[PDB]
Write a protein that binds this ligand. Structure first.
Ligand code: HEM
Ligand SMILES: CC1(C)[C@@H]2CC[C@@]1(C)C(=O)C2
Ligand SMILES: [K+]
Length: 404
C-alpha cells in the first residue's frame, strides 16, 4: 500500500486492487461489484498500485469520460508508470487532436472491413466448432476463444500465425501482467516487432491493415512512421485481447445456464439482444484518466496529476442503471452499459466485436446446444485492464450435437 497522500481523507480509503481483487474467487464482475455495496462511497481512494481514485457508480463514470478537459486520456492506465509509458493512438490523445486518427483506424477495423471479412469469420467459426463437436470436450480458451478472433486479426494484419504466441504474450503483459514484464517493456517489445514491418510496408504498400495505417492520411496529411506504429500497436492489443476474453466469460455463463441456451436456440432472432445483455453483465474493461488540474468532483478534492480509474465494467453493473444487475435477462428492456467506453474514445472496433460474438453464439448453439463445465472444474479468473478467464474446460454428449 502506497502512503496515503495528505490531500486524501482517510474516510474515502477503500484498498481495492484492480490486478488482484479480494473477492476474485466469486467471479471477476462480482469482485469489482463490491465497490457498489451500500456502504461504499461513489468516489474512493485505493492505496493499491501506487494509489489512485476509483469512480464506483455509472453516473460519475459517464460524467468523467465526457469531461476530457479535466480527465485527460494522456495517462489512462494504472499503475502510474504504465499510464506514463502508454502512448497508443488514438487513446493517449484528447480532442481535438484525437479524432483525425479515428478515421484511419476505422479504415482497418470499421464496418466496411467487417463486411469484407464476414465470410472468413463465419467460415472460421464453423470450421473450429465442427472440428470440436464430435470430441465431446474442449479447452475453450485455447481451442476457440483465442484462435477464432486472433487468426482473423492476423489475416487482416497480414502477419504470420507463427508470431501469435509472441504477440499474445506481449498484449497479455499490458492488460493482465503476470509479473515477468512491465507495461513499458511489453509496449516497447510490441513496437520493436512493428517497426521493421511498417518500414517495409511504406516502401511496398499492400492491402493489409498495417499497410493501410502506415500509408494513410489523417485530416488530409500523411501519417508519420511513429504515429503509424502507435496506432498499429493499439490495433494489435484490441485484436488479440478483447473479444478473446469476452467470449470465455460468455461461454462460461452459457455452460451453467441451460434455460438461457434454450431461449436462444428456440428464438434465434433474440441472439443480437442476448449479445448486448452478455456485454453488460460480462463487461470486462477498466481503464481511466489523469487529472489535468485541481478539480472538485462530487464533493471530493481531486488534485492535478491524480489518476482516476473509471471502470467501464461497473456502469452496467450499477443497480442505479439496471435493476437486479447481476441477473442476465435477454428481455431486459433498457440495457444500460458503457462496456465499449463512453465519450470521444468510444470503441471503434465494436462492429467487429459484435459480429464475432454473434457469429460465435449462433454457430456454437446450432451445433453444440447442450454443454456444461467439466465436472469438478473450478474456473479461475484474472483481473486487469481487461479481465480474463484462465481456462474453461467444457464437456458435452456428442449424441446431442448436430453437424451442419
Ligand atoms: C468485447 C470486445 C471489446 C471491448 C469490451 C472493448 C472496449 C473498449 C473500450 C472500453 C474503449 C475505450 C477506452 C478508453 O476510453 O480509454 C475502447 C476503445 C478502443 N477499442 Fe475496443 N473493445 C473491444 C474490442 C475491440 C476490437 C476487436 C478492436 C480492434 C482493434 C478494438 C479497438 C479499439 C480502439 C482502436 C479504441 C480506441 C478508440 C479511441 O481511443 O479513440 N476494440 N474499446
Ligand atoms: C482499453 C482497451 C480495451 C482499448 C483498446 C485496447 C485497450 C486495452 C486499450 O489500451 C484501449
Ligand atoms: K502517457
Amino acid at each position: 500500500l502506497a502512503p496515503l497522500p495528505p490531500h486524501v481523507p482517510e474516510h474515502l480509503v477503500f484498498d481495492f486492487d484492480m490486478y488482484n481483487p479480494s473477492n476474485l474467487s466469486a467471479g471477476v464482475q462480482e469482485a469489482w461489484a463490491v465497490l457498489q455495496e451500500s456502504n461504499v462511497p461513489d468516489l474512493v481512494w485505493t492505496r493499491c498500485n501506487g494509489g489512485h481514485w476509483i469512480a464506483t457508480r455509472g453516473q460519475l463514470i459517464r460524467e468523467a469520460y465526457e469531461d476530457y478537459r479535466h480527465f485527460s486520456s494522456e495517462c489512462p492506465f494504472i499503475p502510474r508508470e504504465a499510464g506514463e509509458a502508454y502512448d497508443f493512438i488514438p487513446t493517449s490523445m484528447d480532442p481535438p487532436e484525437q479524432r483525425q486518427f479515428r478515421a484511419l483506424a476505422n479504415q482497418v477495423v470499421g464496418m466496411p472491413v467487417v463486411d469484407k471479412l464476414e465470410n472468413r469469420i463465419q467460415e472460421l467459426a464453423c470450421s473450429l466448432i465442427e472440428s470440436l463437436r464430435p470430441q465431446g470436450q474442449c479447452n475453450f480458451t485455447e481451442d476457440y476463444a483465442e484462435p477464432f478472433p486472433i487468426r482473423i486479426f492476423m489475416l487482416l494484419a497480414g502477419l504470420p500465425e507463427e508470431d501469435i504466441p509472441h504477440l499474445k504474450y506481449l498484449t497479455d503483459q499490458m492488460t493482465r501482467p503476470d509479473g515477468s514484464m512491465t507495461f513499458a517493456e511489453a509496449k516497447e517489445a510490441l513496437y520493436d516487432y512493428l517497426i521493421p514491418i511498417i518500414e517495409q510496408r511504406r516502401q511496398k504498400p499492400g492491402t493489409d491493415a498495417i499497410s493501410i495505417v502506415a500509408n494513410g492520411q489523417v485530416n488530409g496529411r500523411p501519417i508519420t512512421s511513429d504515429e503509424a506504429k502507435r496506432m498499429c500497436g493499439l490495433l494489435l492489443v484490441g485484436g488479440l485481447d478483447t473479444v478473446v476474453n469476452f467470449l470465455s466469460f460468455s461461454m462460461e455463463f452459457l455452460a451453467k445456464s441451460p434455460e438461457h441456451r434454450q431461449e436462444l436456440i428456440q428464438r434465434p432472432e433474440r441472439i443480437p439482444a442476448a449479445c448486448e445483455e452478455l456485454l453488460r453483465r460480462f463487461s470486462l474493461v477498466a481503464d481511466g484518466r489523469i487529472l489535468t488540474s485541481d478539480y472538485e468532483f462530487h464533493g471530493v478534492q481531486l488534485k492535478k496529476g491524480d489518476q482516476i480509474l473509471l471502470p467501464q465494467m461497473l456502469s452496467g453493473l450499477d443497480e442505479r442503471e439496471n435493476a437486479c444487475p447481476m441477473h442476465v435477462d435477454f428481455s431486459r428492456q433498457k440495457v444500460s452499459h458503457t462496456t465499449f467506453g463512453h465519450g470521444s474514445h468510444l470503441x471503434l472496433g465494436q462492429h467487429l466485436a459484435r459480429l464475432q460474438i454473434i457469429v460465435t453464439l449462433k454457430e456454437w448453439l446450432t451445433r453444440i446446444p447442450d454443454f456444461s463445465i467439466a465436472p469438478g472444474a473450478q474456473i479461475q479468473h484474472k483481473s486487469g485492464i481487461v479481465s480474463g478467464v484462465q481456462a474453461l474446460p467444457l464437456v458435452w454428449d456428442p449424441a446431442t450435437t448436430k453437424a451442419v
